[PDB]
Amino acid sequence: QSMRLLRASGRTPEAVQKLLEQGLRHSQDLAFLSMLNDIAAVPATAMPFRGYAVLGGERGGPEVQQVPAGERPLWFICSGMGTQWRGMGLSLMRLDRFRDSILRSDEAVKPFGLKVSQLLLSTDESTFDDIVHSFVSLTAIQIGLIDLLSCMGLRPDGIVGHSLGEVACGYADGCLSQEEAVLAAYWRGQCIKEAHLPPGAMAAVGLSWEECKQRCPPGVVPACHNSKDTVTISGPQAPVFEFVEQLRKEGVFAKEVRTGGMAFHSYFMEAIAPPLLQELKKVIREPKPRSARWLSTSIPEAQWHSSLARTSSAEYNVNNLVSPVLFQEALWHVPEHAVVLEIAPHALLQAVLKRGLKPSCTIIPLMKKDHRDNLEFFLAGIGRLHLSGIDANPNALFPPVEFP
């Protein structure tokens, strides 16, 4: 499985192009490429032009640009809202560190008879229609992506999650373990499955959160504060569709969100809190404290200096399911020149992230739903870190090659 990321640096664009050209004409010499990648670690101060190319496959045209001087902070965004699709991650399964993560996850769900790998390796179009399947798979993949990133020594300066994403976030913050985090996905899924709730629904709507609060029919609530003029509403299905229709009729923006007839982050879920709280309290014994890096979207800023806030307990994670997603409010804290990575099997939030952030923020997705080959895509993403001054050596992602 030849494909490699090559990164380059130099005091002139032409230096980098020439460099990339050489790697291209030595595509199959891994010892050589590994060397080139070690070389590229050079301050913009010294060598203000950086470039990259993914050798193997064809998103492989080179990218070169001038890097600006200085420190840029790295931010992890973990998506959650339904980023599932038939064949997630088989793409990335070629990276041993990734495959090893997922198998390590399988270990956590060996009981309950579920193989996340079997799930991903599956080929049934209905396979991810199951809530528990999706939930675990989503979180599995996020952990994998996190592990890939961490192997290149990438420590995030800030972490922000969205619904289920706050589980991944815990893992990223080193609050939850792989075992802990994966079961959190499982139980959250299982408790819901078992509940057999009425028919619910959710919808993205181009009103303000306040306007949403006011204009909302009874039983239908604002659920996710995605941006300043985008909010996902949530409640019993009948009225959710009725609302989205009236809204379209009057030229507001209004896109259904597939969620399996479910009203998440609403009173509906309140039913499932006590069972979930039970199970999770078993899984997260001696809960760990959350760091200042990890901004919470379940709890609002004002009650952050708080006990529920203090740690990522079963109490914290149950609250997440019930409480609304205060995402935009967290985004407000991401600084001006942040590099931001969407950690998710699909980059659903790219739109909202771009919208709720500034030209000087750089936003990098790591996977695209149904992409020809997500390794290429992910590698490209890693290339983009280079172009943005972040030091991330791809050599780490592949087997070593010393002494030819």
How does DSSP assign 213-281, residue by residue? Answer: HHHPPTT-EEEEEEETTEEEEEEEHHHHHHHHHHHHHTT--EEEE-SSS---SSGGGGGGHHHHHHHHH
Indicate the number of domains in the chain: 3
Pick from 344, 348, 7: which is nearest to 149 by CA? 344
CB 63 within 8 A of CB 52: yes
On whether both 188 and 321 belong to a single domain, the answer is: yes
This structure's resolution (Å) is 2.8
Consult the annotation and say whether 290 binds a ligand.
no
Polymer length of the chain: 404
Single residue among 233, 261, 289 that ends a domain in this structure: 261
- Count CB-CB contacts under 10 A for residue 303: 11
Q: In which region does residue 179 sit, left (phi positive, over 0), alpha (psi from -120 to 50) or beta (all else)? A: alpha
Of 163, 234, 313, 323, catalytic = 163
Domain span including residue 88? 73-195+262-386
Instruction: Say how far apart CA 240 and CA 264 lie, in whole Å.
Output: 13
Q: How does DSSP assign 158-196, residue by residue?
A: EEEE-TTHHHHHHHHTTSS-HHHHHHHHHHHHHHHHHH-
DSSP for residue 289: B
On whether both 82 and 223 belong to a single domain, the answer is: no
On whether both 164 and 246 belong to a single domain, the answer is: no
- Count CB-CB contacts under 10 A for residue 342: 26
On whether both 67 and 207 belong to a single domain, the answer is: no
Examine the residue annotation and report whether 234 is marked as an active-site residue of this protein.
no
Using the structure block, give the residue that is written with the tokens 């800030």: 158
On whether both 89 and 178 belong to a single domain, the answer is: yes
Cα-based angle 198, 201, 203 (whole degrees, multiple of 5): 165
Pick from 321, 301, 312: which is nearest to 223 by CA? 321
DSSP for residue 91: G
Consult the annotation and say whether 258 binds a ligand.
no
On whether both 105 and 122 belong to a single domain, the answer is: yes
Consult the annotation and say whether 130 binds a ligand.
no
DSSP for residue 301: G
CB 237 within 8 A of CB 60: no
On whether both 175 and 61 belong to a single domain, the answer is: no
Instruction: Say how far apart CA 20 and CA 22 lie, in whole Å.
Output: 5
Instruction: Say how far apart CA 74 and CA 367 lie, in whole Å.
Output: 18
On whether both 38 and 181 belong to a single domain, the answer is: no
Using the structure block, give the residue that is written with the tokens 């050798």: 55
CATH of the domain at 399: 3.30.70.3290
Count H helices, E strands: the chain? 15, 12
Consult the annotation and say whether 124 binds a ligand.
no
